Each structure stands twice: as structure tokens, then as C-alpha cells.
């Protein structure tokens, strides 16, 4: 097939890593997440998360509104205990152009009130984001220079921290998009290696592998990973991890916009190392 020439950074890391979510929701815990919607142009979003199990209870609802087709779009993601915060997307045209976006990120009560701009230009074979996290006290910078070419792809990321330190912690990766696979290697700053590869060779069959070397002369962590898009709404997982991790994701579709997917881990039979836990998942969803 084909595709475009852009992507950002955060491209195999997270269609892979969607790729790798796709165990259920959560390895244990139950997140009842109810997406709602207003022909008005009002978009929302009611979620209700059990985490750790039940070692924590959170619950977090949010609202989306979508401005003209050309104007923008905010996205008022408030809470319930908890923090807040906003979006301010910005677009040139339809056609990519370049597209800002401002956060009004922040703390409610006893946190360090930080808002920041995210940035961000795109076109043929290259995009590059300005992120900027003007938070509390010292100001962040973000920076990222992805370079396109032909079936070809290179990265480089840098991050800026405080006023009177220039560098903080950057990172840079290589490799290249292809027509439905995706193949990079991620060198994380601090002296990392590590890299990924997705391969689809069919829609209904779905592969991935990851791992990374940590430098000094550290062992190794493996990633088996794959989805099969089963005809029916309902797909499931691989998760097998060569470095000690042996669990599997099972995803499952009930028609309309309700639907439920369950997962789980099983670590052998650990004492004082790990056992079997599940994980939850409920989306009850509407029209309105």
C-alpha cells in the first residue's frame, strides 16, 4: 500500500505500544470508561478508573469541544479530586501546515501550577516539535528533529531543563517507515540501547518485538508481542516476555458501543517475586 511521509517521534513507540495496550485494560484493574457525544459540536467523556485493583479508587470525567472546521478545538479534561487543566489546538489549514496547541496544565492545591505551549510543524518528509513546558520556577524545553526519506527515517530528540542548565536528559533513534511495518531503534539518553519492530503481514495477523541493552555490561530484556484482528469483535494478545514476563491480553467487542475487554498475567507461581493477577475493562458508550 503506502500510507504518508510524516510521523512524529512518538511513532513506533506507540503503535506498538497501543499494539502492546491492547492486553486489556491494565494488567489489574477495572476502568469503566463511558464516551458520550452532542450533535451541538459538544464532545464528552465520562471515565471511572479502579487502579492496583483495588489498592486505589480514581475517577475521571472530561469534556471535549470541537471548534469550526478551520478554528480549533479545546479539550477541557477536568477531574474529580484531583488536577485539571486545557487545550487550545491551533491549525493553519487542511493542509497540515503548521499546528500549535497551548496547555493550561496545571495544580490544583498543594502542586506546582505549570502550563506550558505545544508546538509543532509538519510537511513532506520531515516534522519537528516545539514543545515548550514553561512550568514552575525553571521553565522546560522541548525539542525534536524528525528527518523523512524515501522508505527511509531518521530522529533525534533533545530536552532543555531550568534557565541556568542548558541540557538535561536527550535522546535520538533511527530507522525507517514502510508500506503497513515499522522498524526504529530508540537510543535513550544516559547511555541506551534498545530498539523495536512491527511487521503485519496480514490484518487479521498482527506481530511486533521489542527490547533494549542497557549499557555497562547489563544482561538483556526481551518483548514478543502480536495481535491477531480475529474477524469477530474480538481480538486478542501474545504478551510473552522473554525476560520473565508470561502474560496474556484478551480483547473482546459487544456490538453498538458497549464493549468489554478482559486480560491477564501469569508470572509462574512467585512467593516474594509475583503471581497472577487480572485486569478490567468496560466501555459503555451512547449517542445523544
Known sequence: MRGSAVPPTYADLGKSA???????????????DLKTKSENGLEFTSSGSANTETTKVTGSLETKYRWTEYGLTFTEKWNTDNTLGTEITVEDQLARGLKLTFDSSFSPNTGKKNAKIKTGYKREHINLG?????????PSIRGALVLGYEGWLAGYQMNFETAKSRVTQSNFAVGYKTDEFQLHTNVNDGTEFGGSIYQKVNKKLETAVNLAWTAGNSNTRFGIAAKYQIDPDACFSAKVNNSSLIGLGYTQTLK????????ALLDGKNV?????????????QARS
Do not use: Q
Open 18 to 32: 497501543r499494539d502492546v495496550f491492547t492486553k486489556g485494560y491494565g494488567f489489574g484493574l477495572i476502568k469503566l
Open 130 to 138: 516545539c514543545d515548550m513546558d514553561f512550568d514552575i520556577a525553571g
Open 256 to 263: 453498538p458501543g458497549i464493549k468489554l475487554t478482559l486480560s
Open 272 to 284: 516474594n517475586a509475583g503471581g497472577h493477577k487480572l485486569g478490567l475493562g468496560l466501555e459503555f
